[PDB]
């Protein structure tokens, strides 16, 4: 009976709610303001001009079907609140194939605040498209972008927004860094508009700046490049008679420049 | 229409307090933070802190952080600062703007003048 | 905190005549730079935000523009009644305004 008042003010926010309709439709834009918490930074594949992240991908926005007055100021509650009401359909624009965890449950949190305004984060694995100009590899570096907007909702239908200061909104977990090869140097944000077959969108872009570490291909490529190199030298120290031994060392470290030349394009696209 | 109206010209000793308001019309007070700027004679604006109305969370600039305290009354749609230990620096024209987004601040105060001597 | 600096202290340009103001940011901004007019005895009035986007009901002489870290209000023709104080401010973080730009004639 004690949860009784709480059931009947959820079942009186529902009541006559239209969830296929954006707050405020036909007559204000719908301000979303969202912001990123990177758990961890996934790695890079190169190979595919792509990289993982882990983030929960947070975004609030106003709802006046969703005013309630009661003892509690917050209504803390499940994923099951949020397919029951509207909510915005982000997307990630050089997204390739991401993933929203729901293990055990949804990981999905769904707050409502006695003044409609709503917070509604969940967990992802956004799998990202970073196209990378690898002409000083190994020593480059990527900005690599997250851009994300609405799908559907033009510019005069839904508009996004960083909930805090730009700088301050997409925050990297301290501990959270599943780079090998690569060191995040920063982060850097922006807002645009993107014109489109169907209309203009506010796109929210996000720019990782990245920095590889050339300590692997140091000792694996420039290394062995490098002593080949010295092998090929300590033939000019052995007497020009010797021609079979100096013979083998030149097709020798030949042949070994040639299979280090096939064998390092194999990382890379 | 919008208007922020703010109190008005002050004068003032140094050591003693002031407290400065800017009184909202137009849009929902809770919406969007309230900033603070200042604006000694010729000079650049500078940015003392902003409120957040709807939880009343301040953020201040680290050269006036405990100089100036921001509060903030839902009931009537003002917005107050606060401040300690005048000196004459002090002595300048403050505004009140409100953020309509990350982008640009839309409304701005009347300006009150203030002097310190 | 990001610096704002305006290279043109002051600007003589006579009436009529194309004037370009400049706006630099010591760090990465991103388009959030805003330009505000302050009249003698007035507080700041928008003009242009996002860099580029004019405000409504500003004349359409103004037109602001940059990339990050260089910014430029453009005032195609300017009139008796552009003469004021001109403030570029960022709000990519902690808004920091710079050091006013006046024109004179």
């Known amino acids: 009976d004690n949860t009784t008042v709480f059931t009947r003010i959820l079942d009186r926010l529902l009541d006559g709610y239209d969830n296929r309709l954006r707050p405020g439709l036909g007559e204000r834009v719908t301000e979303v303001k969202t912001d990123i918490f990177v758990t961890s930074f996934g790695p890079v594949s190169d190979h595919d001009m792509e990289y993982t992240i882990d983030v929960f991908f947070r975004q609030s926005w106003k709802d006046e079907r969703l005013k309630f007055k009661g003892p509690m100021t917050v209504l803390r509650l499940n994923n099951l609140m949020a397919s029951k009401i509207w909510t915005p359909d982000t997307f990630f624009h050089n997204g390739k194939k991401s993933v929203a965890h729901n293990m055990t449950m949804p990981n999905k949190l769904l707050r409502i605040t006695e003044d409609g305004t709503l917070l509604y984060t969940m967990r992802l694995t956004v799998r990202a498209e970073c196209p990378m100009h690898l002409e000083d590899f190994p020593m480059d570096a990527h900005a690599c972008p997250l851009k994300f907007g609405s799908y559907a909702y033009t510019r005069a239908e839904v508009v996004y927004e960083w909930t805090r200061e730009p700088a301050r909104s997409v925050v990297v977990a301290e501990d959270g860094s599943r780079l090998n090869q690569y060191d995040l140097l920063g982060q850097t944000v922006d807002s645009g508009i993107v014109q489109s077959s169907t209309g203009e969108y506010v796109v929210m872009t996000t720019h990782f700046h990245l920095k590889r570490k050339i300590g692997y291909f140091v000792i694996q490529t420039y290394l062995p490049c490098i002593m080949t190199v010295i092998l090929s030298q300590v033939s000019f120290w052995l007497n020009r008679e010797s021609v079979p031994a100096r013979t083998v060392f030149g097709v020798t470290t030949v042949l070994t420049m040639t299979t280090l030349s096939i064998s390092a394009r194999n990382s890379l696209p | 229409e919008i208007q922020l109206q703010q109190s008005g010209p002050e004068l003032v000793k140094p050591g003693t307090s002031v407290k400065v308001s800017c009184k909202a019309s137009?849009?929902?007070?809770?919406?969007?933070?309230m900033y603070w700027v200042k604006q000694s004679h010729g000079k650049s604006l500078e940015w003392i802190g902003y409120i957040d109305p709807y939880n009343a969370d301040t953020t201040y600039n680290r050269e006036f952080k405990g100089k100036a305290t921001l509060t903030v009354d839902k009931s009537s749609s003002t917005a107050f600062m606060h401040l300690n230990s005048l000196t004459s620096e002090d002595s300048a024209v403050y505004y009140c703007?409100?953020?309509?987004?990350?982008?640009?601040?839309?409304?701005w105060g009347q300006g009150t003048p203030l002097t310190v001597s | 905190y990001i610096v704002m600096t305006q290279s043109p202290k002051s600007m003589s340009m006579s009436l009529g005549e194309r004037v370009t103001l400049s706006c630099r940011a010591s760090?990465?901004?991103?388009?959030?730079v805003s330009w505000y007019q302050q009249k003698p005895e007035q507080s700041p009035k928008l003009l242009i935000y996002?860099?580029?986007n004019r405000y409504t009901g500003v004349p359409d002489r103004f037109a602001g523009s940059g990339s990050a870290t260089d910014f430029t209000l453009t005032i195609t023709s300017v009139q008796a009644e552009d003469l004021a104080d001109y403030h570029c401010?960022?709000?990519?973080?902690?808004?920091?305004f710079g050091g006013g730009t006046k024109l004179e004639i």
């Open positions: 760090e990465y901004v991103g388009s959030y």
């Open positions: 401010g960022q709000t990519y973080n902690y808004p920091t």
């Open positions: 996002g860099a580029s």
């Open positions: 703007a409100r953020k309509r987004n990350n982008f640009y601040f839309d409304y």
């Open positions: 137009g849009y929902s007070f809770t919406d969007y933070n």
